[PDB]
Amino acid sequence: GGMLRFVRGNLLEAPVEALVNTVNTVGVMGKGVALQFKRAFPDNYQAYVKACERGQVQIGRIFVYDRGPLAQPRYIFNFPTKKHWRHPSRMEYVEEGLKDLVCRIQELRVRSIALPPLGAGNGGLPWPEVKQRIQEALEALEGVEVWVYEP
Ligand SMILES: [Cl-]
Ligand SMILES: [Cl-]
Ligand SMILES: [Cl-]
């Protein structure tokens, strides 16, 4: 029963197994979605900082933090949309990230996941095009309920 739904509300409240946080690769969660994630999920933030220090966080390479089998959300999928926090999000980086998103969902047998609009909206990437790429990527997931929070 896989299904893609586009919704409004507080991403952090989504009642799912995995949340996507939109991040950069330099180890800063200072604004926007990432700031909300830093405040809500401090252990993910520290793990993310260490993964960045190691060079593990790169374009097309989601950094997943596991909060444990009894947690909800269990996973934080730290999705890079840009290198430095001052740079804009870039469409190529969202495209490569969405491919890896599918990879990590499958690897981890995640059955429900919620995403922000991946750098779209409010002066960022064009939402119609981002929405289209999300649809292309994430309607080819069998059995996964995907919730996308609109700009
Ligand atoms: Cl940031
Ligand atoms: Cl958020
Ligand atoms: Cl956490």
Numbering used by the authors: -1 to 149
What did the publication describing this PDB structure actually write?
The toxin of the system (DarT) is a domain of unknown function (DUF) 4433, and the antitoxin (DarG) a macrodomain protein. We also show that this modification can be removed by DarG. The DarG macrodomain adopts a typical macrodomain fold composed of a six-stranded mixed β sheet sandwiched between four α helices and one 310-helical element.
TaqDarG-macro and MtbDarG-macro share the same overall structure with an RMSD (root-mean-square deviation) of 0.89 Å over 149 α-carbons and a 56.4% sequence identity. To probe the requirements for the de-ADP-ribosylation activity of DarG, we devised constructs with substitutions of conserved and ADPr pocket-facing amino acids. Interestingly, mutation of K80, the equivalent of the main catalytic lysine residue in TARG1, showed the most significant effect on substrate turnover out of all the mutants tested and resulted in inactive TaqDarG, indicating that this feature is conserved between TARG1 and DarG (Sharifi et al., 2013). The reduced catalytic activity observed in the G119E mutant is most likely due to the position of the residue in one of the loops involved in ligand binding.
